[PDB]
Structures are given as C-alpha cells and as structure tokens.
Amino acid sequence: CXXXXXXXXXXXXXXXXXXXXX
Amino acid sequence: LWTSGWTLVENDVKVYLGRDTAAIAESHTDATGEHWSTTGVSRLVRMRPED
Amino acid sequence: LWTSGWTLVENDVKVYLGRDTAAIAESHTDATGEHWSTTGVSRLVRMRPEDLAAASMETVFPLPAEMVNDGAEYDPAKDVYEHQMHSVHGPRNAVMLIRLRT
Amino acid sequence: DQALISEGKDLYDVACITCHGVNLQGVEDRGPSLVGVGEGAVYFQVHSGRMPILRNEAQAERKAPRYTEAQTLAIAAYVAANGGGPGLVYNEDGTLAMEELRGENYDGQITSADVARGGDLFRLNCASCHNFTGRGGALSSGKYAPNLDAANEQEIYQAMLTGPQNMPKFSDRQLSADEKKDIIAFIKSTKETPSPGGYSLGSLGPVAEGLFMWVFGILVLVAAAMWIGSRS
Amino acid sequence: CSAGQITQTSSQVAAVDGNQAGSANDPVLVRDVTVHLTTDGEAGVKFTAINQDTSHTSHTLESVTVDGEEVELDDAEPIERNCSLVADIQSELDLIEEPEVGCIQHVATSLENPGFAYGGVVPVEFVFDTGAITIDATVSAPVLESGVENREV
Ligand code: HEC
Ligand code: HEC
Secondary structure, three states, X not given: OOOOXXXXXXXXXXXXXOOOOO | OOOOOOHHHHHOOOOOOEEEOOOOOEEEEEOOEXXXXXXXXXXXXXXXXXX | OOOOHHHHHOOOOOEEEEEEOOOOOOEEEOOOOEEEOXXXXXXXXXXXXXXXXXXXXXXXXXXXXXXXXXXXXXXXXOOOHHHHHHHHOOOOOXXXXXXXXX | OOHHHHHHHHHHOOOOOOOOOOOOOXXXXXXXXXXXXXXXXXXXXXXXXXXXXXXXXXXXXXXXXOOOHHHHHHHHHHHHOOOOOOOOOEOOOOOEOOOOOOOOOOOOOOOHHHHHHHHHHHHHOOOOOOOOOOOOEEOOOOOEEOOOOOOOHHHHHHHHHOOOOOOOOOOOOOOOHHHHHHHHHHHHHHHHOOXXXXXXXXXXXXXXXXXXXXXXXXXXXXXHHHHHOOOO | OOOOOOOOOOOOOOOOOOOOEOOOOOOEEEEEEEXXXXXXXXXXXXXXXXXXXXXXXXXXXXXXXXXXXXXXXXXXXXXXXXXXXXXXXXXXXXXXXXXXXXXXXXXXXXXXXXXXXXXXXXXXXXXXXXXXEEEEEEEEOOOOOOOOOOOOO
C-alpha cells in the first residue's frame, strides 16, 4: 500500500565522466 | 466555371499531356515499422506522338 | 500500454534525444499557385550535452537515427517531417531532460 | 567605461550591501552571490523593479522601479566586472534593443509567420508554467508565474536568458536567438491584439466564462422572471 | 506562513553554472567555478577568489589543478582585504574591464583539454599559500554572444 517496488538508493555514488575520443 | 487547369497555358506555362500510369504508393519496412512513400513514383508521365 | 517510442532501443535502433524546433511548413508560390513544401524542414533536431545550462529543462522526443535530417549530412531534399511529427505525437513519448546545478 | 563602474558601485554600496556582501559573494540567508550572473541579470532584476528585496517570502514581487535606466546600467557594469555572464542584446548602433526583438523577420510590424512558430515554442514547454497567452499561473507554495503584460522585450529576453526565481534558465544553445525573437513576437502579438469577438474575460478561460454566467448571467434572467411573474 | 524561518527566497542560490565553497567563517571563498571548454577545443577554469577574513593576512594562490594537470595563471598579486581575483579564459575575459575603484584582479587561465566531457563533473583544487580548497565543478561551454546566435539546421 505504502509503495509498490520503489526503494531508496543502495549506496551513495560519485564518478567523473571524462568521455574522450581525442 | 470558366477555368479548367488548361488555362495555365495562357499564363506562359508549358503544360504537357499527362498519361496516367495509375502508380500507387510503395511500402517500405525499416527499423521504424512500415510506411507508405510516394517519392520516386510519378502518377502522370509525359507522352510522345508515337505512343 | 507497455510500450512507447523508446522501446525501439531494445531492438537495436539508435534513438537520439530530439529537441522540438517548432518548425512550420513553408509557402512556395511559383507559376502553379501556392504550395506548402515542408521538405527540407526538420522539426526534431539532435541536441548536444553542452546545449543546456545548469538548472534548465527541455522536452525531448525519441528521434531514431533513420529520420535525422541535420548536422553534417543535412539533405535539403529529404522529407522527414511526418515521421518526426509521429514521434512528437506519441502518447508516452515526451521526456523532460533536466540539467541540475552542480 | 570606467566612470560607469565607478558610480555604479556607489549605488551598490548603499543599497545592494546587506544581502550579497561587499564582494558580491552573498550572505548566508539574505541573498545569493552576484558573481557570474552577468550584465543581463542585473538589468532584469533592477529595471523590472524586482530588486531590491524588502522581505523574505515565497517569491519576490515586481514593483515600482527604484533606479532609472542609466543607474541600472551602471550597477550592471559594476556587477559584470566581478566575472561576467549573459549580456544585454544590442542592435545596429550602441543602444538597447526593444522594438527589434519582435520577430526574426521583423521590419516594422509582426510577421504572421513568426507568431505561428513562436506560438508553438511558447507552448512547447513554456505555456504550462504560465498560461496560454501568458496570463499567469499558480505554483507549489505561494509561488506563481507572473502575468507577462508588464515586461518589455529586453526584459523578456533577459528573463529567459537568466532564469530568475524558479523560472528555468534558457541559454542561447537551448533556445536560439531566432526562436527567442519568435517567442517575443507571439507574446507581444497576443497581448496587443483585441479579441475578434467579445470582451475577453481576462483570457482565463472556462473558469471566468462560468462565473460571468452562473453568477451574473442567471441573475439577470431571474430578475426578468421576477418581473413577469408574481411574488405570491 | 511562507515568510517563516525557512523561506523560498533566502535559501536560493546563484542560478549560474558552477558551485562555490565557504559561507561565513572561512578566510577564502571561491565563487562560480567551472571548467570552460570552448566549442573548438579551448579550455580553462572560471572562478572568483574572495579574501574575506577577520585577521587580515596574505592569501596568495599558488596553483590550480583541475584533474591531473595544472593551470596557467598570470602572476596574480596576493588577494588583500576586501579584494577579489576574477579568472577566466582570455577570450571571455576581453569582454569585461578591470575596475580602478575597488581592488579586483583579472587573470586568464588555460588547460591542455585531456578529455573533459560537457555535463561531467571534475574535482578542481585550489592551492593557496596557506590551505587548499577542493570542489567538484561542472564542465560547460562559455556563454554565447546574446542575441546573434541562430541555428545551422
Ligand atoms: C518561455 C517562452 C517563457 C516566457 C516567455 C516566460 N517564462 Fe517565466 N517565470 C516564472 C517564475 C516563477 C518567474 C519569476 C521571475 C521573477 O520575477 O524573479 C518567471 C519570470 C518571467 C518574466 C518576468 C516577469 C515580468 O517581467 O513580468 C516573464 C516575462 C516570463 N517569465 C515569461 C515561471 C516559469 C517557468 C516555471 C515555473 C518556466 C518554464 C518559465 N517561466 C518560462 C518562460
Ligand atoms: C534582502 C535584500 C536584498 C537586497 C537589498 C538586494 N537583493 Fe538581490 N537578491 C536577494 C534575494 C533573496 C535573491 C534570491 C533570488 C530572488 O528572489 O530573485 C536575490 C537575487 C538577485 C539576482 C538574481 C541572481 C541570480 O541569477 O540568481 C540579481 C541580479 C540581484 N539579486 C541583484 C541585486 C541588485 C543589483 C540589488 C541592488 C540594490 C540587489 N540585488 C539588492 C536579496 C536582496
């Protein structure tokens, strides 16, 4: 009733994209 | 009621005699389903005095 | 109700994020009356990840690679308007892209 | 210019001081940092009479301007010297463009082909937050998107350029110059055009047409019925 | 009721690209920090260092490191009391002018463009004479000349 299948994050995240191809 | 699309001849337009080829749309199936296109197809075609 | 235009991703189609440029049909009158051409006009255009400032929102639509008519390979005699208008008129196609502040 | 900055910081130092701090770095819960906002964000906030804030609430109000045009531009020049962002749009000679951003193909009047495109853009993702013809709309909690009648074209451009309050920011990369000019064309055409048929009841729509009839329309007909019939 | 202790106006932020560090009890502030990368592959850092500290000292900036490589500063003088150091790429720094009224220093910056992605976030690090400030900053294109930029299509 409260919530179907939506749950909070597993663990906090961080990254740097740095999508390069020169 | 005066005009008939042949009246374009009086406006210095070059009107041909168009033979009806009764061409229909072409089906094209792609990654994005099937669609009917009429790009390459000409309904009316010019005709010759030997045809 | 399971599917939208984005489901095309599953079956190996490359869909872009198409921004709506709200382009209309262009009038072209010459010797045989007036006609609305809507050829060479593209209403969905590809967008880059620099085109959006922080704290902004843009509605995007599923533009597959097949009906793209912009960039280096713009063909001014290619008609893609009706397909892009099918994309924009999908019941579940609209997606809002938000760039958040850092 | 130099004198512009000089006398533009004096007005800052005696007004925009408590909030925003000395070096435009902001104060904790009084006002943000003015670093990088640009010459176009100061113009919109000051000229439109928004700034300065008098009290913290849900949303700052447009009111009577505190500064003139020249004073606004001086403060803007001073602010932009602390790291500049969006700038004012100019035309041919050094002057602020006003009746030039009335369409891409604008000459002396609005092209009907500009309002058509501007209308769809202004309705693509802009006709929601506000209204249909920019009559204003409600927001979350005491906030709202204001009626668009009071803003000049430069203010419209600078509003979208540097999204203020909750209004999202629209850069040139998102909405190009031509698109922005078309949006202005539509805005200024729908405002300045009288309704073809009738007295447009504030253009609000079904809620204003239903109050005119259900409360006022029926009352006249009741008064007519009360006149023909008897009270017994 | 909307004018309480938590309001929707007091808590608002700069509404620009790139965040800041330090609020009240910090000697040095950085404002509006991004990694600018011009369309045609010209890189640099935008920031503004404000030296606001009770015990007036010398807070000269030694170096800036975006991810792995440093930044070419322009021998900026130490930031004194009620001063500022506005830095950007030279191309975007010619649009504004150095005031003679306060004490504001304009400095140009540059990078090598190793491979920054638009929309990505990178850990910019400032090293002063005393202390370092590390903040994540977005990678974005500089603001366009307003009102001149149409579409290619
Ligand atoms: C896209 C084409 C548009 C147009 C034409 C406008 N907006 Fe908005 N807006 C919103 C909020 C909450 C504000 C407050 C701004 C402030 O006063 O600080 C605004 C601001 C404006 C103005 C300025 C007011 C005036 O001068 O009258 C104008 C002219 C304006 N807007 C029109 C709300 C939103 C929003 C979501 C809440 C979105 C999306 C937009 N606005 C976008 C546009
Ligand atoms: C309480 C007093 C207060 C004063 C006085 C004040 N401001 Fe502000 N200012 C704010 C607050 C709060 C905001 C938050 C955004 C908003 O509500 O518009 C703000 C926002 C701004 C913005 C929008 C920046 C952005 O893009 O986020 C500009 C520009 C601005 N102020 C400039 C000025 C100028 C110029 C003055 C000149 C006197 C001034 N302010 C005076 C409190 C103030």
